[PDB]
């Protein structure tokens, strides 16, 4: 189960 | 920012002449992920050598396990060929099978 949100710089 | 890979050439199980085994090449601790790795048999590049999916450790350094199935013999010499952006020339590491 991966992180449902998003990583954005 | 850039790190050189540690090369390890070894067999899955203890190597006995005539008994089927797997030749492994463990590159690890390098950055970036772009790396060239070949398994050698008598200096000849081995056809169809596979590797694991690219992953990294706690310090962001990548590692890969290049492997192929082989049968050791008394007179056949095996090695790994590794080229990286940190290495000036490709590095050939021989297989010391009685370590």
């Amino acid at each position: 189960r991966a992180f449902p949100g998003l990583r954005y710089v | 920012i850039q790190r050189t890979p540690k090369i390890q050439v070894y067999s899955r199980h203890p190597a006995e002449n005539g008994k089927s085994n797997f030749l492994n090449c463990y590159v690890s601790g390098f950055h970036p992920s772009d790396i060239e790795v070949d398994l050698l048999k008598n200096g000849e590049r081995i056809e169809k050598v596979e590797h694991s999916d690219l992953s990294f450790s706690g310090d962001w350094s990548f590692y890969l396990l290049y492997y192929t199935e082989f049968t050791p013999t008394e007179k056949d010499e095996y090695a790994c060929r590794v080229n990286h952006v940190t290495l000036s020339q490709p590095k050939i590491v021989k297989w010391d099978r009685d370590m």
Partner: protein
């Protein structure tokens, strides 16, 4: 203890490769590669193959979504550090659970790297961020304004941990069954008055092992050359520790292996 961890890699190609892998302890179970015909999240362990297509469509959803942000992020990092567009650059993502005694979250992780250096990381309190430079402070300000750390708390102490417990039960026959090390000692001379005692450990899972060469019972912490725990290729691992000893003094040195697969720490003697 137990742990789930994801490892994302994004490399920029001038004119972006996106690879993501997931681990439960030292066992990989999922993979996503952008360099595929129809890229999808694929199982690398048997205990995730029994998940429904609904789970894999959901997993592939975030992968394809995160690869899009990794395209945007790598381009934003270019302007942050004012680097040219002719070079290749790497952006990694490391997040996951750490399971504790009861079954609750022990430690939570959410780390970002840029070109092998730390970029920004979620602090252990799961409320604050640690930016490594002024460029990451832009990302930090971006995340505090959106309350991103709020989202990670709900994941790490929630969805993260619950699914780590779920994998450890659906794959309890392999993830929770430890394999003991098959150990042996070799002896090679390096001088006419010196030798190298090498203590081997093969075919053990998990990868957590500590090999120690002790002289007269006391730990020879230094003088003990040690190598990285390497994978054997079948899910188990290998490792060796060596010590250079004077010839005729080898009967003074003992190797000591402790692993979860061993009922008791065993003592070797070449």
């Amino acid at each position: 203890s137990h742990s789930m961890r994801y490892f994302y890699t994004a490399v920029s190609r001038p004119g972006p490769r996106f690879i993501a892998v997931g681990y439960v302890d030292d066992t990989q179970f999922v993979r996503f590669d952008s360099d595929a015909a129809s890229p999808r999240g694929e199982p690398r362990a048997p205990w995730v193959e029994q998940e429904g297509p609904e789970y894999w469509d959901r997993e592939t959803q975030k992968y394809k979504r995160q690869a899009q942000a990794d395209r945007v992020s790598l381009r934003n990092l270019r302007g942050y550090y004012n680097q040219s567009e002719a070079g290749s650059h790497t952006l990694q993502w490391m997040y996951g659970c750490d399971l504790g005694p009861d079954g609750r979250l022990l430690r939570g992780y959410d780390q970002s790297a840029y070109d092998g250096k730390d970029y920004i990381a979620l602090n252990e309190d799961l409320r604050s961020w640690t930016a490594a430079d002024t460029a990451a402070q832009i990302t930090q300000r971006k995340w505090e304004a959106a309350r991103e750390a709020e989202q990670w708390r709900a994941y790490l102490e929630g969805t993260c941990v619950e699914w780590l417990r779920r994998y450890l039960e659906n794959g309890k026959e392999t993830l929770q069954r430890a394999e003991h090390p098959k150990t042996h000692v070799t002896h090679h001379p390096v001088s006419d008055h010196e030798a190298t005692l090498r203590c081997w450990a093969l075919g053990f899972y998990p990868a957590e092992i500590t090999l120690t060469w002790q002289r007269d019972g006391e730990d020879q912490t230094q003088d003990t050359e040690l190598v990285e725990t390497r994978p054997a290729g079948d899910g188990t691992f290998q490792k060796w520790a060596a010590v250079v000893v004077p010839s005729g003094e080898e009967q003074r040195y003992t190797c000591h292996v402790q692993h979860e697969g061993l009922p008791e720490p065993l003592t070797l003697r070449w």
